[PDB]
Design a protein around this ligand. Structure first.
Ligand SMILES: Nc1nc2c(ncn2[C@@H]2O[C@H](COP(=O)(O)OP(=O)(O)OP(=O)(O)O)[C@@H](O)[C@H]2O)c(=O)[nH]1
Ligand SMILES: Nc1ncnc2c1ncn2[C@@H]1O[C@H](COP(=O)(O)OP(=O)(O)NP(=O)(O)O)[C@@H](O)[C@H]1O
Ligand SMILES: Nc1nc2c(ncn2[C@@H]2O[C@H](COP(=O)(O)OP(=O)(O)O)[C@@H](O)[C@H]2O)c(=O)[nH]1
Ligand SMILES: [Mg+2]
Ligand SMILES: [Mg+2]
Lengths: 436, 331, 431
């Protein structure tokens, strides 16, 4: 095929991974036992799933958490049969919200079977594109073991692509004070390897389920379901194949103008309560309008005071090319949308024709046509500066550093990673300058 | 770059510490796998780093950090030369009722042990020999000073005496005054080849991946009427090791490296504490700080830092941290 | 990280260990004899954190009980849930310390220490993912302080990568008979600052004050306090006996709590306040719960936090209430008193909620506070101590038992630098 391989690390990455493959099975039509009614035991979905012998369609995913409580739910849940059991790899002592225990002490002893098993998945394929890594920016497991894991995947698989799905931490459900440290570290070490990192502000997801779903204290469940829906919008152009959708690797090329500038703000269109019923479907024009409201955004930032460098729209459901073009006309000049003087102000659109299947009892009101926009804007730097502030107070007094150094790492790695962060911010500046 | 330069030379300032830096040359490993030399020294006063940077747009450029110091030793000068300006003008101190010291700060592979522990013409041996050549001199013998020496290691956050074959020693304070290294065997010497003997007692009694894995303190003590008069310490520390350089796991090697970087962290925060004066400098943070307390804030104390740095591009991160703290030292 | 091995020694320490195992053996649903008599399975998802399993529905408390006084063990057998303790785990000396630190550290405790280390050994040889070690004791006496600190040192040098947690109590001339206590205290601190990870501080002065002013008990008995401490213990162990994302294991617990390696002295506090066997008809709400458990009238150590600043806090609420109400009152206390929090550490207060409430309450709230005001507790002792070591009273006890005498002024310089460390991070703005 043109296969892919998903990887899910840490509490967040594993739970959100379960929501993701949940939705994958729903949309593509598979029951928790791994059987499909329509297939013949080389299709658009045979990139994310492999066929066994008895038509037991099985994912191409490796799950890892250093403390097996979060993966044991997989082997007790409805999909315990779905998985090849050898790729539900678990440790013993959780990294304890400590990056250095991921990157050095704990991860070293497990990485080798992690990659013998990822190997066991890669030998199944005939032409693998890249790996999809799902992890959190916060917890020790997902930061450390992903930084190292990528440092290894770049050795064993240099030619291949590597797409990050990253979970910016929200103070409301933050389970640690040292979240800035972990985030800055794993961004620093992961940058030169990863090709494209989709960022998810947990704060933003919380606000979404505060407004449009009207949940007062949304559980981790609600958030994982919503994020899963968005990820399904992004991957849908990989998992289906009409004459009107192009590869995510086709317009990945257009989203990343510079090697270090590979963070596309995402935006997802209709988000409405299934409880708060009585609803008129939205036109292509209305959801294309919503794709520019900071409410329906993924990261907490403000693109109106920032410049654009690209724009992608992945529509799914009922969409005619002319509807898209007209909506794009209504949006083009009527708004204060700005491009850098070195970039064509063009849009590429992936029309996928499968509707958005929501969740049984999933408080996502099912809809007929949706759009997910990937905008590579310079205002995303906000989310970095929100980090480097919460950082540069603590690191100003070196508070909490003694743990990370106490599990192997030096101090100078901090001043280096931070200096590199400020460098990245000044790069998101240098993008904005013009010429004459 | 490199050549096509160096017209201007060095007119410095008044310091509170003799801060100096040594550059070691590349070896067979960094040359076979052709690493690059990114440190140059044109005058005995200027350390230049050629930080290889890259703009956002992949245009390679050079961030040319310049670091003036007390003295800059390049990739040639032997232990003699380093001793002559780092430790030698410090022998004067201890004879004149003084308490001097000497640092070996750098990264693992920068050459601290080779400058202190030789191979065996190290600054231990050389400083001792200049102690016993001046004690011959007429106006120094007219003091009848009895010479002693100690040699002990901090490892795993505890103190062991190398002359007394790895015996555990406590560390106490009491009445301010001094930090009393309780239990320390203090061996009397009266000639240079006594000192060489104690030296190769400790150098081989040390814990040892063929590198000095413990903090070495080598004292040369003076006692007139038995009461303390002089104390010159010579210190070979472990280097600040990366962590990003993965040791081959090992249950005790990670203990060692972690404790090393934690002691060096405490020391480092005490540097950045004195540089701006926090009225509570955190010296009771680690055993190492608890020691160097009087090496810094002693009443009649002098001291010297011999910094060491590798010249390879791979080391440049470490190198810049070491030089940056050596700059924040010069006060 | 799962298994936690628990140990109690000294009069006070054994006592409070008993009260602990009482309230938590009821909350987990274990009967006095040792069979599961619960209702909800919420009490068994993380039961393995404090009990080994003898096959046959026998929950053996992974615990060890020690004393140099041969008596003590009697108070165990009369402990209503005391038969559940494993036979081998009873290791009791027969000399007795009599309020002497050096007798417990360099003398007789030096003899029984290796007897305890073997039972600890065979306790760790049967643990899947051994978390760390959790101890209970007292500081003003003889056995607990000394033998405790020695034990911590040897465990530390045999288990360096396991968390070191200690629940220590304080002497004060309001409950302590003798006055050899401002010595054993400073010694114990000298070892704790250098060998432990976490440390919870309980002041006898605070428990007397609460028993007299609030509970109106003019004549405070010695169990009236053990009640008050066991409650707090259940409150701060909730995060380790029940499931939840926040404060899962002890490593995580110290991570969001320990900004600097030495500063690790907490000031627990509980709301509401009750006497023994007296339930709450007008059981407390939420704004009074959080408005009390951050005031000083419910704290467990004689330290007014309003004088200092909070470094970190971990609030825990138990029962069934509203989540939004919880987090809202938390941040309300935070920002209406942002003048009491180091603004250079943000997101510093972490609050979780557990379903099962404590016994006798329907809604409760525990407090854990690493404040800069804790130095007031250490400026008091270094005053009862510098006023007795400048006079050298009773020094033939310790010094005449193999102790250095300067291992005292060592502890005075150590604690008098610690005080300067808590005062350091009290006025450092985010410049
Ligand atoms: N959206 C979402 N975020 C999560 C979830 N679980 C954890 N997080 C985020 O992750 C951060 C904490 O890291 P975790 O992922 O829980 O920790 P971990 O990866 O299991 O690593 P350890 O805790 O050391 O085992 C918090 O700030 C949360 O916001 C989840 O299920 N969904
Ligand atoms: N001036 C010099 N010229 C040539 N080689 C040198 C010089 N100084 C040091 N070296 C080399 O540096 C190597 C490492 O020395 P050493 O001081 O033991 O490393 P280190 O800095 O001590 N690492 P560590 O043991 O953790 O302290 C020696 O084997 C020498 O070959
Ligand atoms: N709250 C409380 N304090 C106690 C108890 N027993 C002793 N103490 C205190 O602990 C100090 C030392 O007493 P003791 O426990 O007999 O000494 P130790 O066992 O050798 O540590 C005294 O000052 C008492 O105030 C107790 O049961 N409860
Ligand atoms: Mg985990
Ligand atoms: Mg060395």
């Amino acid at each position: 095929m043109r296969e892919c391989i998903s990887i899910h690390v840490g509490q967040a990455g594993v739970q959100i991974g379960n929501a993701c493959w949940e939705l994958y099975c729903l949309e593509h039509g598979i029951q928790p036992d791994g059987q499909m009614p329509s297939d013949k035991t080389d299709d658009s979905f045979n990139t994310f799933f492999s066929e066994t012998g008895a038509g037991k369609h099985v994912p191409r995913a490796v799950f890892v958490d250093l403390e097996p409580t979060v993966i044991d739910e997989v082997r007790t849940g409805t999909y315990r049969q779905l998985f090849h059991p050898e790729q539900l790899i678990t440790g013993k002592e959780d990294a304890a919200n400590n990056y250095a225990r991921g990157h050095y002490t704990i991860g070293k002893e497990i990485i080798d079977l992690v990659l013998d098993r990822i190997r066991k998945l890669a030998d199944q394929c005939t032409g693998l594109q890249g790996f999809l890594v799902f992890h959190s920016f916060g917890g020790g497991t997902g930061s450390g073991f992903t930084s190292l894991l990528m440092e290894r995947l770049s050795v064993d698989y240099g030619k291949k692509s590597k797409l990050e799905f990253s979970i910016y931490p929200a103070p409301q459900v933050s389970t640690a004070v040292v979240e800035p440290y972990n985030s800055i570290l794993t961004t620093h070490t992961t940058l030169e390897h990863s090709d494209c990192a989709f960022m998810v502000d947990n704060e933003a997801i919380y606000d979404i389920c505060r407004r449009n779903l009207d949940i007062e204290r949304p559980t981790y469940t609600n958030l994982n379901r919503l994020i899963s829906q968005i990820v399904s919008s992004i991957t849908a152009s990989l998992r289906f194949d009409g004459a009107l959708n192009v590869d995510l690797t086709e317009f990945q090329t257009n989203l990343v103008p510079y090697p270090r500038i590979h963070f596309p703000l995402a935006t997802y269109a209709p988000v409405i309560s299934a409880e708060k019923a009585y609803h008129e479907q939205l036109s292509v024009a209305e959801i294309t309008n919503a794709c520019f409201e900071p409410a329906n955004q993924m990261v907490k930032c403000d693109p109106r005071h920032g410049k654009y460098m690209a724009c992608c729209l992945l529509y799914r459901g009922d969409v005619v090319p002319k509807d898209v073009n007209a909506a794009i006309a209504t949006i083009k000049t009527k708004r204060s949308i700005q491009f850098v003087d070195w970039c064509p102000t063009g849009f590429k659109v992936g029309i996928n024709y499968q509707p958005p299947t929501v969740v049984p009892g999933g408080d996502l009101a099912k809809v007929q046509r949706a759009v997910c926009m990937l905008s590579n804007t310079t205002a995303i730097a906000e989310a970095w500066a929100r980090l480097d502030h919460k950082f540069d107070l603590m690191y100003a007094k070196r508070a909490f550093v003694h743990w990370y150094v106490g599990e192997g790492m030096e101090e100078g790695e901090f001043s280096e990673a931070r200096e590199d962060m400020a460098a990245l911010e000044k790069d998101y500046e240098e993008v904005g300058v013009d010429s004459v | 770059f490199r050549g096509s330069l160096d017209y201007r030379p060095l007119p410095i300032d008044e310091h509170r510490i003799c801060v100096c830096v040594r550059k070691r040359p590349l070896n067979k490993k960094e040359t076979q796998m052709k690493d690059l030399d990114v440190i140059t020294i044109p005058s005995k006063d200027v350390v230049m780093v050629h930080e290889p940077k890259q703009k956002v747009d992949l245009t390679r450029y050079l961030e040319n950090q310049t670091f003036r110091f007390d003295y800059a030793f390049d990739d040639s000068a032997p232990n003699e030369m380093v001793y002559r300006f780092t430790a030698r003008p410090l022998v004067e101190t201890i004879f004149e009722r003084g308490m001097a010291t000497c640092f070996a700060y750098g990264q693992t592979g920068s050459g601290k042990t080779h400058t202190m522990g030789g191979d065996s013409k190290g600054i231990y041996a050389l400083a001792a020999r200049d102690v016993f050549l001046m004690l011959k001199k007429p106006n120094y013998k007219k003091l009848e000073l009895q010479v002693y020496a100690t040699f002990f290691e901090i490892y795993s956050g505890k103190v062991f005496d190398l002359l007394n074959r790895k015996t555990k020693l406590r560390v106490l304070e009491d009445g301010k005054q001094q930090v009393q290294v309780v239990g320390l065997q203090e061996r009397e010497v009266k000639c240079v080849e006594d000192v060489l003997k104690l030296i190769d007692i400790g150098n081989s009694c040390r814990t040892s991946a063929h590198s000095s894995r413990s903090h070495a303190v080598f004292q040369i003590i003076l006692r007139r009427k038995g009461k303390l008069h002089g104390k010159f310490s010579l210190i070979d520390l472990a280097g600040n090791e990366r962590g990003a350089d993965t040791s081959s796991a090992d249950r005790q090697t990670r203990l060692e490296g972690a404790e090393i970087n934690k002691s060096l962290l405490a020391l480092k925060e005490c540097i950045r504490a004195l540089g701006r004066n926090k009225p509570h400098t955190p010296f009771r943070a680690s055993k190492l700080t608890q020691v160097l307390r009087d090496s810094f804030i002693g009443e009649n104390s002098r001291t010297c830092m011999i910094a060491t740095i590798s010249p390879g591009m791979a080391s440049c991160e470490n190198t810049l941290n070491t030089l940056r703290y050596a700059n924040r030292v010069k006060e | 990280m799962r298994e936690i091995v628990h140990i109690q020694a000294g009069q006070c320490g054994n006592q409070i260990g008993a009260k602990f195992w009482e309230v938590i053996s009821d909350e987990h649903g274990i009967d006095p004899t040792g069979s599961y008599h619960g209702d909800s399975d919420l009490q068994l998802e993380r039961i393995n954190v404090y009990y080994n399993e003898a096959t046959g529905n026998k929950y053996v408390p992974r615990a060890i009980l020690v004393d140099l006084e041969p008596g003590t063990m009697d108070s165990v057998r009369s402990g209503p849930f005391g038969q559940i303790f494993r036979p081998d785990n009873f290791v009791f000396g027969q000399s007795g310390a009599g309020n002497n630190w050096a007798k417990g550290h360099y003398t007789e405790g030096a003899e029984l220490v290796d007897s305890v280390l073997d039972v600890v050994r065979k306790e760790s040889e049967s643990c899947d993912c051994l978390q760390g070690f959790q101890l209970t004791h007292s500081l003003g006496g003889g056995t607990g302080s000394g033998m405790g600190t020695l034990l911590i040192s040897k465990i530390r040098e045999e288990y360096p990568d396991r968390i070191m947690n200690t629940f220590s109590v304080m002497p004060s001339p309001k409950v302590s008979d003798t006055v050899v206590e401002p010595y054993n205290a400073t010694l114990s601190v000298h070892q704790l600052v250098e060998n432990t990870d976490e440390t919870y501080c309980i002041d006898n002065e605070a428990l007397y004050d609460i028993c007299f002013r609030t509970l109106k008990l003019t004549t405070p008995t010695y169990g009236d306090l053990n009640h008050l401490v066991s409650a707090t213990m259940s409150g701060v162990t909730t995060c380790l006996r029940f499931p939840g994302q926040l404060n899962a294991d002890l490593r995580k617990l110290a991570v969001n709590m320990v900004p600097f390696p030495r500063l690790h002295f907490f000031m627990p506090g509980f709301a509401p306040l009750t006497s023994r066997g007296s339930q709450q008809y007008r059981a407390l709400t939420v704004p009074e719960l959080t408005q009390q458990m951050f005031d000083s009238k419910n704290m467990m150590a004689a330290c007014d936090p309003r004088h200092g600043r909070y470094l970190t806090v971990a609030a825990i609420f138990r029962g069934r209430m509203s989540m939004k109400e919880v987090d809202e009152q938390m941040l309300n206390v935070q920002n209406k008193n942002s003048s009491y929090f180091v603004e250079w550490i943000p997101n510093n207060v972490k609050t979780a909620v557990c379903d099962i409430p404590p016994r006798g309450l329907k809604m409760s709230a525990t407090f854990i506070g690493n404040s800069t005001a804790i130095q007031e507790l250490f400026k008091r002792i270094s005053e009862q101590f510098t006023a007795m070591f400048r006079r050298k009273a009773f020094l033939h006890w310790y010094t005449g038992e193999g102790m250095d005498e300067m291992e005292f002024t060592e502890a005075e310089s150590n604690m008098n630098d610690l005080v300067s460390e808590y005062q350091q991070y009290q006025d450092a703005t985010a410049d």
